[PDB]
Write a protein that binds this ligand. Sequence first.
Ligand code: HEM
Ligand SMILES: C[C@]12CC[C@H]3[C@@H](CCC4=CC(=O)CC[C@@]43C)[C@@H]1CC[C@@H]2O
Length: 399
Amino acid sequence: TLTIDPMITDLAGETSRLRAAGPLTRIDLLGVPALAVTGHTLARQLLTDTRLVKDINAWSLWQSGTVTRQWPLIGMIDVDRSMATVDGPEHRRLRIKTTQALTRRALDALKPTIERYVAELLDDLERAGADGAVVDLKSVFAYPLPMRVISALMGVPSEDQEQLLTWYKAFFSILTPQDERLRVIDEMHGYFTEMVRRKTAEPGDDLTSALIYATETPLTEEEVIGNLQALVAAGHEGTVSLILTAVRALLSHPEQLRLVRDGEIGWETAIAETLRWDGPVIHLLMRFATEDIDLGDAVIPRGEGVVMSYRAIGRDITVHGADADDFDITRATAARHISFGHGPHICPGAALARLEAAIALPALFTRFPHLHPALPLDQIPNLPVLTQNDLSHFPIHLG
Ligand code: HEM
Ligand SMILES: C[C@]12CC[C@H]3[C@@H](CCC4=CC(=O)CC[C@@]43C)[C@@H]1CC[C@@H]2O
């Protein structure tokens, strides 16, 4: 069994240990055992296997009361009913209105909004960078942008977004005391409950109102609340990491940065290789076997929990080759990654996340062509967030 270090002290060694022990291996998540899927081919297979569900009531550890809400990771699994917790035909019903809102056409009408948030945040970088002062790319640029974009889509007031970010920081950190974590989870549920009620009595041009007023069976209020929570949480968290890890990877590989600025390699292709090599998700919790799953050299027992170790999956040497642990935007398999998932629960906002990074990254390097880091890589740790690739900071000189 591999114990996942909640402090993320040795992410590179742990990721390689997971790859070496895979494609299926036992992990320990803060005292709770589970199975981690670390192989790319096995992941794609299980992600489309209908004997694996997200419903926590299918977990034997939850049924028996062995895992309770005292577990610091329980907020990642015991969530309100939504597209993230259901499978089968009900899943399509809880997802279809959202996917209609995230089409290639639908995002075109949203593209100018993103471009304005980007331009506003670039000005914040310039203001904080007066007199050659080092600026935190994260806190000034990468962290606020995805929250402003998902808030505009969902209809979250601008005045409320700081509070949401404050809640999410405590929610993700393993250093949050468990009584405070549970209080924040409750306060967040109460916030989105009251927002859904407010939008029910006053709909707007936003996705929350669309989820309430669709004209199949209408979503229950619980399901709208659950979808809203999953959309804001995933919608703001992942893209922050993507923007920062892409900048970090290209600044430390200047010859590849030259390729994208000169147009030899598209930004969309650099974003794909960032997702494969250093993506926003480390481990995805959690799936549960409704019956014994015979793989042929291993069995997944009924009721067992199954984690998708997407970071290890991205480093799969069988699919990507011997240099899988290297960042190379020119590799042929960069588009074959599954860092947005696979199967029916594949990220519904994958196109929006790709668009946000595809706007922000060239915007950043056009506005500040000579930007460079103010800290070396060994002084940029991950935050203690076990399941997410969350960077502490990225100080830069604007140049
Ligand atoms: C770089 C940015 C992002 C990454 C890497 C990412 C990745 C993922 C992954 C790995 C999953 C779950 C796959 C699984 O179940 O195994 C997921 C689910 C989900 N994501 Fe994303 N995501 C990103 C951005 C977004 C955005 C922008 C939105 C919304 C606009 C979003 C909304 C969701 C939702 C609602 C789910 C649950 C879908 C379901 O269970 O049917 N995410 N995402
Ligand atoms: C894990 C995640 C952030 C946490 C999200 C999760 C989707 C379901 C969910 C809804 C909540 O109420 C809290 C956070 C969670 C648990 C997201 C899937 C993509 C992103 O990485």
